[model samples]
Target chain A: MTETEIFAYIEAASIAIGIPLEPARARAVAHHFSRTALLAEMLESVPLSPESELAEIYRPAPFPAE
Target chain B: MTETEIFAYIEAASIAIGIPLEPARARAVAHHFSRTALLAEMLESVPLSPESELAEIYRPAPFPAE
Candidate 1:
């Protein structure tokens, strides 16, 4: 597959998810994509146990804890 | 409602939310919108428990789970 700008792919995914990319908003997406790319690349260096439990993405809190 | 195509609605939302989507991405957005619409429709078919307690929408990670 031909490599395109990371922003292009971000725009692509956003669109695929039903987001419309306006020019300025597209640029904003591009910036966000770049940040994500940097983070993803950083994650590649982490050593992980294949059996390690995945981090929780979201959940409801039962109550406030001090 | 003119029954605008799901993609059109997504396109509108993406633009409204400042997403810069392309033609290829637009199609994906449309499909996602259709799937989401179905899921939303399903929600109308069910009843929520009156005393189920309110579900927290978000919270500070303890990240407190809201």
Candidate 2:
């Protein structure tokens, strides 16, 4: 999206979320949003096989009883 | 910290980040911060041995080539 579009989006989002921003701060938000979108786009390009599976569990190492 | 303290902290954080928040939004941010702190506190209460180790590796199930 263009900077203007991003700025507009920032304005709408702030209003929708009840977080009003100053004009300068709104522009800053737009800048960061653009950068965030770029990182998201980079993640989107990653290739994953259909069979790829997430980790089954997150069990930490057990401590021995005293 | 109390709600007032949380609100002040939210205000300070916003200014430090160059993003000022409206009063109502600041209150909401403070509320969320309190909840997040509680979660962190809960995590801190979990017992762990100094020798506890993280999972060393992550390997996906092998996908058969078509």
Candidate 3:
């Protein structure tokens, strides 16, 4: 993406999540943003079968009586 | 929710979505918002089996044009 488009996305997402971004810091912020987005794009294309499943968040076990 | 709390939330969501909300419109907007939120709250309490699943977005078919 062009610099202006990327910065605009950064601005919108910052507002969406309630973070304020000074114009000066936006370049640095978007540098990290693009870095993660690059890795995310790579991750999305990796093959996964329909049978692949997510792990359970957690399960509560009964507390032992002291 | 208290009227003040609802208005605070209404203001935040408006900012998040990049919509300007006049104080005049917010009361009306939140009246409908609370109504939908009430239905959503009820829907969340309804029991759903673990086997229930989300619908797929859509699937692609090969083009047959020669």
Best by lDDT: 2
Per-residue lDDT tens digits for candidate 3, residues A6-64, read 66667655654457689878778989877776777788788989878544323365568
> How good is model 2 by TM-score?
0.37
Write one digit per residue (lDDT tens) for candidate 1, span A1-66: 112445445555565556778879888767766677677768868988878654544455557789
Collision pairs in model 3: none
Q: Please report, in order, the local distance difference test score of every candidate based on alpha carbons.
A: 0.62, 0.70, 0.68
Instruction: Arrange candidates, best lDDT first.
Output: 2, 3, 1
Evaluated on chain B only, what is the TM-score of candidate 3?
0.70
**Candidates in descending TM-score order:** 3, 1, 2
If both were scored by lDDT, which would come out higher, candidate 1 or candidate 3?
A: 3
Cα lDDT of model 3 by residue, B1-66, tens digit: 545555666775566445788988988998987687678778978888987754432336656897
After TM-score superposition, the amount by which residue A39's alpha carbon in candidate 3 deviates from its true location, in angstroms, is 13
Candidate 1 chain B: minimum summed lDDT over ten consecutive residues — where? B1-10
Task: List the candidate 3 regions with Cα displacement exceeding 4 Å.
Answer: A1-66, B49-51, B62-66
User: TM-score of chain B, per candidate?
Assistant: 0.60, 0.61, 0.70
Candidate 2 C-alpha error for residue A24, in Å: 1.0
Residues B1-66, model 2: lDDT tens digits? 556555655665565345779988887787888898678778778898988766555657767899
Best by TM-score: 3
